[model samples]
Target chain A: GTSQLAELVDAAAERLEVADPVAAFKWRAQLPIEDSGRVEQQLAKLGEDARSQHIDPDYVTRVFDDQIRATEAIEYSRFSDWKLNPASAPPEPPDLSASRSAIDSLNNRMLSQIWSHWSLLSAPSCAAQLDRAKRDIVRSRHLDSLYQRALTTATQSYCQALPPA
Target chain B: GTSQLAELVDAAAERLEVADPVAAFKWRAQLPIEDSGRVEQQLAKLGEDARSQHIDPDYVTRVFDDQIRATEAIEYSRFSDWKLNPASAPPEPPDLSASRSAIDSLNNRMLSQIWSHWSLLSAPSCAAQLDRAKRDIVRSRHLDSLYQRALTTATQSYCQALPPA
Candidate 1:
């Protein structure tokens, strides 16, 4: 049901919390916000994995594209926030390798949930329900426009497939 | 409803898989299945924690007792299974400190869930629902009578607070 789908999006949104620390680490090291080659590799693997699960490859690519976008945006936002307010930054970022490993793990878990609930997530009624479902997450997480838009953009494509014309 | 409950129990059951290595380490050094003082300390702290959250202390104690019981049973089963099938044993048990720390972390998480859903869990209708919910877990995990009964006994008290006359 939509309840499960809502929970999935909310959980996925929370996964972006790492953006703060990852941003801190990368900015300190003067690295790019995202790696183009790395993301392409992830999307390629995700599509193949979704196909193996009998999920629509295009559907996964569309949905996960937003997920990646939101992650990048948040990391950029965190970096901006720290620059404007130097004291707001973490004293020291988490171990860089461990943070990347954790993000990869969360990505796999998110994909598993999406594949499991593809039917409900892709239903015509999904967009409406998602709007309602995400309000709680936004308030609870204290997500500003950057994170909120990131969350919405990440999940908005869940219903890109329409019924027969 | 029960769908969520089933998933919770299944997830909780998976948390017990660590028992294998925990047992291997214990048996190798002849440690007990449980440490009575440590358990007493856990229960006492849990009672205080539950009270702070306005949860039923007695209910927490009862539910948690079964959780502890099931955990011990699994550790014993894994130890026995290893003795009977030494070839099936792990190359080496996990670090003793890390395993203990992980179990403690799992216990805290379990308590958090119990507190969140206490009303339904303590409802008059819970036992029947739990029976159906746990069935999938049993099949999926290939749990034997020892682990199965351990799971049941741990949860049977959930409905102990019967309706008042």
Candidate 2:
């Protein structure tokens, strides 16, 4: 069966791209490590020697940062005259050792950053603004672990690059 | 007869807090000057010699940043990890003054530091998602200048403090 994570990934990607931390947190939580991410697929591709499923956190950061940081740089344009590096300044690309590690790193960092900064996501006047529902999803330590699971899953799915079963 | 534009300042401050750049742009256009900026009052109290009639753009920015930076730093506490300042890992308060300056030194450097970086108000999705009416009010350059004029009116509105009728 297919991993069925395209929808989740796409949704998270869109929100992160548009700079919506709240939405990104929600969608990222829903990704699974089965179906396309099933383990038999992993040993087949990376070989049986591979131990646990761990994706480099930096890779996923690249995808999210490229857009989010670019937006930061541009929005801070008004403050450019005073800045050393404008807010929109994008960080350098992540160190992608391989495909799976690269993609998954981006996911972890994206969620981590979102979870850590959820208070900044709200209208100023909402008396009890930046509430948990708006800020809680990113605080998922369990979900952070899930990144590796999904990585193993993604590796299995990517094996479509391999010969058909 | 009165050297205060309290309402204008409050309204301007209110609108500026939202992250919708478009609304910030629009609100700046239509908002009346006499009712748009308390920042001037605060700055003037600081013995900055800030004027209300002629807006010193950079000084005005300092005032805007004064408020923007403070409130944002306060709000950023929600996302405990993604606190935006990596040096301390979770800074008790993100340094807002690392990029402060006066009007005469209005170089793009200080400007970028204040506007471009990862402040609470720099998100594009924030701009896209706000209601049209809210966006319009926020984006009003008229509203912006109104804040400026409100400062001026507050200063001159007092006969004793006046240059002369």
Candidate 3:
């Protein structure tokens, strides 16, 4: 079980690889960093999709919401850097649609993973496991905070579910 | 500037409301909890994207990686609860896609807020502001951890950027 959780943690770390390309595309395209309308549209559809899969709509939405916030943090931070130093911006931007599509696919798969392992994820050892996994891949205080934010919505229930001390 | 960061922390706490529902959905789905293949694909893409943006690809990836782990903790914790009592599952799941869409919008807005006040977030007062905001909204250690994990990546830089004493 610890191994399983470790795998999940490592997988989580792996997912971050996409953030860079997303920031790159947004910066080069001179696109608005945040797309509220488009995000809302996708979230609206997520509910229906979750229901069809026989999952709790609210739960799915909340988890995805955190994911969105986490991604936004990455984008915003990158944008801030670009603003401070435009000369450092990428020489050639990747195709925006292509990058977006890749991210979309990853999001869908990640949501599915969360849905499948909902119970296993709740184990008390999860946080520690995630930390270990993160340390194995990278070591930084800033990165730790980002990971924590992304899971805030998903993990709160663990504490609520905990038996009184 | 610290005030603005405080507002963001408060908002972050407000966003934690959905963790429960997400946990509920995952418990019912009884799906496999992890998918390494998908996770790797995204991480690979992220590095390329970050490079294009002229940001430290490793730094961006580490931030996002943490987010994924944090979110997983929430899912796992919630699942632990549902396992303890199946009867507590929601009677009717909501429209997941729709709710997801709504969250996406909030995320977009939140990112804008972060970008607008990036410096404030990195200020030394950020942690205290975040703590104050959380206390103002919800007073619980469990909730506090969730908030901390959620904002860790975004705010760690704030602490690092602080001037030496």
Candidate 4:
């Protein structure tokens, strides 16, 4: 019940779902698929925060960047899926402002939660936990390979050997 | 419309479908999934045939080996999918002998076809063709990442740089 890796994977999975509302808000507001302004701003903030804590800023940036890209990939895939399956409607969202607010609130909580657990999140042991978490989650998810691939990208930063350990 | 790449992709796709009957026969006949006895015999035959024609036998073997493994991967994935989805039925094979015969017949045609096109298939230019083939096939397959992964593995042997060019 207290696996750090499981928690991170859960975080990643929920982070991916943020794409749903993000895509919805973007579509409703006529915004681009890549919210580069918002994403870069958050990345800057994350890097600064990690530096203040002495927790390798580049590592933090890489992880979050992949997470953001994963969300964008899923977001675009969802849009394509919608175009193909006309009967399967997207979320008939509330106002664009409300949708954006929903995304912001969720992102804030998740990102803050990562900071709160930054020690384990960046620990070497967490990498193995990540591998186990991936297999369990993929099996649990019924082997949805597209989602699995995104999850892989999101977790790759944690497991790489090049970081200044 | 006259792309060499598109034709190779079509061949790869058709090669993949051979897995369907191969899997069917293995299931219906209670044979070991690997079929090492049969696979090894064919591999030996292919190596000799390639050597006799002054082609790089190892390259030929690697390409076909990957194709075989891709078939095996998809075959197992199918079995798992069946367990997960009760309603989705596998092909009810005729008889063990007939199923094996069907697999043999298809394998003969495909292998012979590959030899007939060996000059083009093994050309260095075919590497680029394989890349284009991958993108076209992946998009045409609507980004089924699992099948795309198998397709990548199947075609990888064609594009490696380490081969004695």
TM-score of chain B, per candidate?
0.79, 0.25, 0.62, 0.71
Candidate 3 regions off by >4 Å?
Answer: A6-12, A123-125, A132-165, B1-165
- Tens-place lDDT per residue, model 1, A1-165, is 336666677777877777777878886786766577988998999899878876677777877777776777676555434433446777788977878788777767777777677666768667776777788778878988767767776776776744323
Screening candidate 4 with a backbone cut-off below 3 angstroms (N, C-alpha, C), the clashing residue pairs are none
Name the best candidate (by TM-score): 1
Indicate the TM-score of model 4.
0.43
Q: Mind listing the fnat for each candidate?
A: 0.00, 0.00, 0.00, 0.00
Q: Model 2, DockQ value?
A: 0.02
lDDT tens digits, residue span B1-165, model 4: 344656556666666766666666565555444557888987787788767765567876887777777766666554434322324545575565664565555545545555555666657787767777678877775647656767777777665524345
| Candidate 2 residue runs with Cα over 4 Å from true position | A1-9, A21-58, A64-165, B1-165
Alpha-carbon lDDT, every model: 0.69, 0.30, 0.52, 0.63
- The 10-residue segment of model 4 chain B with minimum total lDDT is B78-87
Interface RMSD of each: 23.0, 11.8, 13.8, 12.5
User: Which is the better candidate, 1 or 4, if ranked by lDDT?
Assistant: 1
Clashes of each: 1, 76, 45, 0
At residue B116, give the lDDT of candidate 4: 57
Q: How much native contact recovery, as a fraction, does model 1 achieve?
A: 0.00
Clashes of 3: 45
Off by over 4 Å in 1: A161-165, B1-165
Q: Between prediction 1 and prediction 2, which has the larger lDDT?
A: 1
Arrange candidates by lDDT, descending. Answer: 1, 4, 3, 2
State the lDDT of candidate 1 residue by residue for B51-129, as single tens digits.
Answer: 8876778877877776776667566455434433446666677887888688777766766766665665768677766
lDDT score, candidate 1, position A86: 46
